[PDB]
Design a protein around this ligand. Structure first.
Ligand code: 1DQ
Length: 175
């Protein structure tokens, strides 16, 4: 590893991680599952009605957006969503102990996973949660790769899975 390579981990954090997995879009679009989304992975609604999505957007941003936001607005919303995922983990009796047991990089993978799937979805992964607490990294990763979350949209989830396996940022290098 070069001096530069060793600096790479200090450039990576949960925000940079999700930014790569979710991308950045300033106009309403449909995600890999066909749900209306904007910014950095902000799910507006699961309704097929675009009108509902725009309504949710205006509520989320606080102005008349007509389906379009600024980069600064995308960032503020993203920060709010990241905070909600972290808070969702820490208050949950099932997820908190697992999260506490993890190293810093795998903690980012945990927040990412919750950001993507929500608290109850993640908390339902009983075997994976046990495997992670027991440092059974390869088993955890194989089991994550069986999930509908990963399988229906692999490109959004693949790096998170690799990150649970290795506890390094390697999956986010060389985009
Ligand atoms: F429990 C958490 F939050 F650490 C976790 C999230 N995904 C797997 N584990």
């Amino acid at each position: 590893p070069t001096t530069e390579n060793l600096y790479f981990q200090g450039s990576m954090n949960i925000f940079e991680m999700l930014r790569i997995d979710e991308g950045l879009r300033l106009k309403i679009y449909k995600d890999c599952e066909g749900y209306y989304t904007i910014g950095i992975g902000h799910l507006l609604t699961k309704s097929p009605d675009l009108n509902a999505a725009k309504s949710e957007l205006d509520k989320a941003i606080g102005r008349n957006c007509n389906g379009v936001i600024t980069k600064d607005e995308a960032e503020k919303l993203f920060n709010q969503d990241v905070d909600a995922a972290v808070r969702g983990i820490l208050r949950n009796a099932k997820l908190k102990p697992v999260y506490d047991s993890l190293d810093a990089v795998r903690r980012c993978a945990a927040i990412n996973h919750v950001f993507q799937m929500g608290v109850t979805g993640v908390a339902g992964f009983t075997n994976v949660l046990r495997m992670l607490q027991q440092k059974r990294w390869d088993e955890a990763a194989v089991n994550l790769a069986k999930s509908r979350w990963y399988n229906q949209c692999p490109d959004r989830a693949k790096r998170v899975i690799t990150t649970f396996r290795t506890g390094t940022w390697d999956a986010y290098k060389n985009l």
